[PDB]
Amino acid sequence: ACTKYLSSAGILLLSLLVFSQLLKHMVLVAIDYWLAKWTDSALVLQSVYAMVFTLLCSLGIVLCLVTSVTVEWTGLKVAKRLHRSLLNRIILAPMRFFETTPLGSILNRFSSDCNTIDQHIPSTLECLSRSTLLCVSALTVISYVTPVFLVALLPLAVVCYFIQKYFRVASRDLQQLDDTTQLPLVSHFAETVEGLTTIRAFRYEARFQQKLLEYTDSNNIASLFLTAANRWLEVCMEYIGACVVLIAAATSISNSLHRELSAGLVGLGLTYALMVSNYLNWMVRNLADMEIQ
Amino acid sequence: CGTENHSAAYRVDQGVLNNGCFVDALNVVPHVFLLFITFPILFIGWGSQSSKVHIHHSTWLHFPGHNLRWILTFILLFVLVCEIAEGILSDGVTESRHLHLYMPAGMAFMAAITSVVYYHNIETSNFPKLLIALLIYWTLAFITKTIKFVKFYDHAIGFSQLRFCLTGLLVILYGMLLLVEVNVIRVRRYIFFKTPREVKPPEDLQDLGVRFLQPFVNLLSKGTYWWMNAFIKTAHKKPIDLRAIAKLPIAMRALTNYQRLCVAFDAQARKDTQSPQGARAIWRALCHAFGRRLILSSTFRILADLLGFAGPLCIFGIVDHLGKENHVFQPKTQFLGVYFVSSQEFLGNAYVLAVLLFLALLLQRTFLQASYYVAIETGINLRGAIQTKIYNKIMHMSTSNLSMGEMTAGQICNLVAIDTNQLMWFFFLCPNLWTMPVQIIVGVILLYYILGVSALIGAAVIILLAPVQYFVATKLSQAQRTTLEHSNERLKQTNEMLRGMKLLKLYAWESIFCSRVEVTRRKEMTSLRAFAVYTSISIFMNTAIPIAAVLITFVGHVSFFKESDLSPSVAFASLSLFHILVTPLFLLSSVVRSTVKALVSVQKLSEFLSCVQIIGGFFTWTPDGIPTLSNITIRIPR
Amino acid sequence: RARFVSKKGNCNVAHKNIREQGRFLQDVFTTLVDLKWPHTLLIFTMSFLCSWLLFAMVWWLIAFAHGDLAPGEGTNVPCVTSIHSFSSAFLFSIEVQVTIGFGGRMVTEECPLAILILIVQNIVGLMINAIMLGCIFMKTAQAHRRAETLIFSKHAVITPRHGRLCFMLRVGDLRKSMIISATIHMQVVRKTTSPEGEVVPLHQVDIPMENGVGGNSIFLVAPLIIYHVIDSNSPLYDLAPSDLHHHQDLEIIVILEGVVETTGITTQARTSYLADEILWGQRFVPIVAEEDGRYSVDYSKFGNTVKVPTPLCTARQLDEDRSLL
Amino acid sequence: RARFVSKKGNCNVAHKNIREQGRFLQDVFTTLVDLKWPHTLLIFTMSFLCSWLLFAMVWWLIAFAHGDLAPGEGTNVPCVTSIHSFSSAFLFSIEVQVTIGFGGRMVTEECPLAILILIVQNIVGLMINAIMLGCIFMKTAQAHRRAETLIFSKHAVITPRHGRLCFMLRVGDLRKSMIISATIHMQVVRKTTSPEGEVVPLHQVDIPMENGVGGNSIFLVAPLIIYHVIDSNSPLYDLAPSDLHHHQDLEIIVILEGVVETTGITTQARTSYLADEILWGQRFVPIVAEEDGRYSVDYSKFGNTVKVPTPLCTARQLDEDRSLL
Ligand SMILES: Nc1ncnc2c1ncn2[C@@H]1O[C@H](COP(=O)(O)OP(=O)(O)OP(=O)(O)O)[C@@H](O)[C@H]1O
Ligand SMILES: Nc1ncnc2c1ncn2[C@@H]1O[C@H](COP(=O)(O)OP(=O)(O)OP(=O)(O)O)[C@@H](O)[C@H]1O
């Protein structure tokens, strides 16, 4: 359900820019494997030390600039393209069918879509591409570090598929209801500021007090739903990722003693196991921010 | 237990030969008994709740020593892992496999796991018959501990024995175990033939729950397992989900509604001091108001720093006993007939201790999200309570109507909302800020046990990465202020375009398309360049993570060149230390600006904290000056 | 849309606020009898095995406490012969419990401890074998299954007989075996409001069987119709034909009781007919047909009904029209 | 202060002047079934052991009467082999009774006395093992426990419905399992005096269930209220609201009967409500609440009652006020 979004603010230059960011992160995991293989060279004891430590810092500034290049000035073309194409696409329309329409949904969805999407879209977008790129990157990297018997990716994407499916549903519902719960509170806050002499007129001022307490009570319950979402999100994702860390320990066991263990990359599956669970965490919550955004 | 002639040897000596293999076999019978009794009661309760049961809606009961029963069930897990770990080493000796040496440890795990199911079956149905069958076990297990100790004293090592360490840990559990068995609410004895506690059966929480669609009660397993299976089943159902995701507020049972009120009431009690109202006075009363959960959740955060920080240390051991130990191939040098406490960082113990680092990683993320959870609940009761005394305060006061004559009171309402939720959001990660420098100092200390120049590289990288974070983010905040002003001009031209929809077709199309598109491109151009500065600071952030990457390369390069040694330790392990640093860097500067917004929000809160007979009545617009109306006298008959 | 009981039976109800689950735990036999066959076999198989292992460990212990099994001394006689392995003690334990008496493992007069233990092993293992016999029998006598053969129609009918409006329901039996002294009770479950302002959610008011004598039950071999005469005491006295089927959302439950001619147990078969499940104007088609040998009953006509000319007025109006006539 | 039966049940009564205890002794089975589990196990364990010792003494006697056990003569063959000790005969006796058949102790054709004795040992030991099976089964079928799940309210209420004063009592069930054909009988136990001068200590007069048909029982899945219409035949016709609760010291008993859908046995649940246990003016709060799936019943409201405006006059006065109106 992203084919509508793929045409937003251009397709070709964004595809080449984000493609160059993905290639820059492939150069980043190339720096990871080169530092790992030269770490095996130091473990075998320089020979290519100028080549190793000099060549291992190439894609640092290149990853820092190219990885942030796809959304570097994308707010400008998204700003004039989305704002000008939207204001022109609604400006050239006849005023009869626009005159027979509620202006609250039009101006609310229009202006809030422009400020909210134009302000908060590229941060969660580039964070989503970075999180997924790192997740599949170290996922397949530590997966190849494991033997082919030690992949076991089908239970990982099985329970992870369960988690992203039903947490996608219940998280969309929870962010929907908790997101929608806020506005009537401020509505009767404006009513609370306006009818103050009416609160002097209402001889039972406790009616708005207990109704008020029901409103803030409902927002507090919605906050408990938010903590439920982060609760099962973090605990479930870190739990299954911890099972992936134990499977990584099995891979280091069989690859360690079952045959000739390599001079390096033994702890690469361990550091990439803990950071693999971190990648499932920020990948899941980044999938949530990509769902709402 | 027999290899060649051991059984005969054991048989010859009086008293079961001081318990050579008998002390181990003695322990096993009780575990079997505790597991053979259990299946009938466990299985039946498993079947009666699967075909026809009415207790599938709402049922809960509490017992004295619940938190000490879980702490003893968790500590017995660490002692069961440990016994087996020592046991594995003994079996390997590679001479003969003694089966009766590691069996007592494997029976216990099943038994202790069966004891947890007995506590759950007892927490469902309240009867003392189970605590009497457990007490019968705790006592038989207590007597078996003595034999090992008794056997051991004659055959004493001191501190050089690993069997003893496991036994010692186990002994404490039995001692701890007695109190649970000493419950006064159990009527299994001949004395007090009636129920000693009649107010125990009825719970306040159940009554909250009985009328509750969703109970949402804290008094649970505390694993965040049922809080997700109740929402989760509905989510999984397709028909149910549509209904649930719409009427969720109705679906919500408003359970913590009886606990929100206490917090409002608690706030008043905290305020009740001997000194006048003050920003400091309301601050320390608020910290005194929350009570347990502040330092409690901070202490759980410090435990999360304890389990989380070590993370990498277990990993080094694998590179040493696996990688560096290339041709060691020597299992033991002590008395091979028993277990010894030395060399506990073995190769296999690095594996199972690495899985123990995974389990403690579940303890660290679990306690981390737990203190996060109590923090979010604390902020919920915070904004609810301060909201309650807030609108009750302005609803009750009605003072200084001159500023209330202006629209500044509505600005106090809007800024009361944005500053109030900005204040709970300011309090949102306060134990994370309290536990951040302990993690930075401890991780920097272990980095100092690695090397010096790497700690200078990464510590200088974070030491430069923080002021660019909060200063460049402050520049993005001023960009949000000016861009918020130009976007407010876009809202003014937007409602002016609503006036254009109220206007004609050709005139508002030409003048409002040209004027609104030109001025909207003007303010959207200033906010477009402001958006380029904000995305430039986000790229500053993107660049910052390679700052750490640069440090990692400069750390290994310069720390390699200053010294004269090479190792695979600091790459994997010290890379791991660097990962830890990132969460605390931007969370540290974000906690700093959260503290500045916290002092500003408490400052704004303290700033807000400030038939008819009529005879000789005087009325004012402002009590600081002379009354506007003087000596007004009239009376109105009904 | 809201239902009380299914068209087949076993109406499910939700219970809130339970006091104790301990009493239920204490009452073991009913639950055991109630549970399905797969779990029931599992309870008796594991509890037996769970016992067999307990009698085997303490027997591997009496040989370990004497120690005669590994040294193989010829003068020292073992309390039980042929105990060479750990498994052998378990095998011996099975022997005593089931009284197999293989003969390979013999018991002597050397240890006065194991012989008293052997008695405790035999009496408890003879007791659970007996307790199991009574529990399996109780499930061999459950009569829910007999009750199923008791079939009720698809819909109901309301037509005037002899000048009075009546409600008709038909029931049949698919077995050659019968039911003795089977009384039927029909209740109208609707939410009524009293003149004082009290709203009872589900009030149960009983309707007459219209037997002249004062009937409770009737001999059921072939499908018979039950009739409900609408008088001044009947709640359906103020109901119209096309207005009552949709406007009202109530239900009427059928309670068929009785005993089996094979087993003493008395069973119950229940169903409910909604406002849309009741038909006005038609009647039940005659099932009984006389042949040369006996009277045959076709069950495909059981769910068939035919429409005949009936009045479109309510019973208060029908008695009012006849009292004015 | 004087009570007849407890708020839970099992009313205790004192009996004086017993004629014979022999009949009770003769009637063994009922008493055995009635006794608790700890003693019951003790009766079957000791009676077995008591038998095992009798079959062992006479077996130690047939070897002592032949005398072949101590001299060890090779030509003289023993009637039973391997009998070396006194204990061995007892072990052999256990073997025959439980049919263990160990094989160590063999019986021969030398003594025609022990073989006929062996038959008497086996038939009596096979008989008590069978008699025990029927006694334990009878306890596996006791239905008092099923009756407990039948709960009665804390207090009672008396309010006028439809213009007539009624007494209300509510009962509920905590199980998913039901009770068939369960008839309820309520009796008023008060000490009445006749016009001739006779004082009967506790007279039991029955009160109507007010079912229109002539009711005995009602289908109980959810908590239902029973109503007692105060007419000219009701003893509570001459009672005032605030004067009857303290002045009178009487009691009204509830008799709930019925059978289990799992077992043929019919059980009874009883309670009693005193003069202070009855409330005037309030009513039973509605337990049934309709949800999306089914109808839920909360039991915390079961012991809750709400007060509504009711007349402070007696039923004779209330019918008198309406007959004058
Ligand atoms: N002490 C007692 N306890 C219980 N029952 C008794 C007792 N004495 C007699 N009965 C029985 O109760 C019945 C009551 O009648 P009554 O007491 O007049 O006996 P009775 O005329 O003396 O004849 P009997 O000598 O058989 O008791 C008698 O038929 C007798 O069987
Ligand atoms: N939560 C419950 N679920 C089922 N039954 C209950 C529950 N609570 C009480 N009961 C039983 O149902 C009866 C209803 O009376 P009520 O609810 O007024 O009890 P009560 O007056 O509080 O006395 P108790 O403390 O014994 O419940 C009580 O006698 C009690 O035995």
Author numbering:
A (entry chain B): 1000 to 1044, 1061 to 1308
B (entry chain B): 6 to 615, 678 to 705
C (entry chain A), D (entry chain C): 32 to 356
From the study:
Subsequent cloning and characterization revealed the β-cell KATP channel as a complex of two proteins: a potassium channel Kir6.2 of the inwardly rectifying K+ channel family, and a sulfonylurea receptor SUR1, a member of the ATP binding cassette (ABC) transporter protein family. Physiological activity of KATP channels is determined primarily by the relative concentrations of ATP and ADP: ATP inhibits, whereas MgADP stimulates channel activity. As KATP channels set the β-cell membrane potential, this regulation by nucleotides endows them the ability to sense metabolic changes and translate those into changes in membrane excitability, which ultimately initiates or stops insulin secretion. Importantly, KATP channels are the targets of sulfonylureas, one of the most commonly prescribed treatments for type 2 diabetes, which stimulate insulin secretion by inhibiting channel activity.
The structure shows that the KATP channel is an octamer built around a Kir6.2 tetramer with each subunit complexed to one SUR1. The complex is ~200 Å in width in the longest dimension and ~125 Å in height, and is shaped like a propeller with the Kir6.2 pore and TMD0 forming a compact central core and the SUR1-ABC core structure forming the blades. In our structure, TMD0-L0 sits in between the SUR1 and Kir6.2 subunits and is the primary point of contact between the SUR1-ABC core and Kir6.2. A comparison of closed (Kir3.2 apostate) and open (Kir3.2-R201A + PIP2) G-loop structures in relation to Kir6.2 suggests that this gate is also closed. Together, these observations indicate a closed channel structure, which is expected since the sample contained saturating concentrations of inhibitory ATP and GBC. An overview of the ATP binding site from the side, and from the top, with ATP colored in red, illustrates that the pocket is at the interface of adjacent Kir6.2 N and C domains. A close-up view shows that the docked ATP is surrounded by residues I182, L205, Y330, F333, and G334 from the same subunit, and R50 from the adjacent subunit. In our structure, we see that the density corresponding to ATP is located on the periphery of the Kir6.2 cytoplasmic domain, and traversed by the N-terminal segment of L0 of SUR1 immediately following TMD0, with the Cα of K205 coming within only ~10 Å of the site. However, in contrast to other ABC exporters of known structure whereby transporter halves are related by either a true or a pseudo two-fold symmetry axis, depending on whether the two halves are identical or not, we find a clear rotation and a translation of TMD1-NBD1 relative to TMD2-NDB2, such that TMD1-NBD1 is ~15° off the symmetry axis and is translated by ~10 Å horizontally (relative to the membrane).
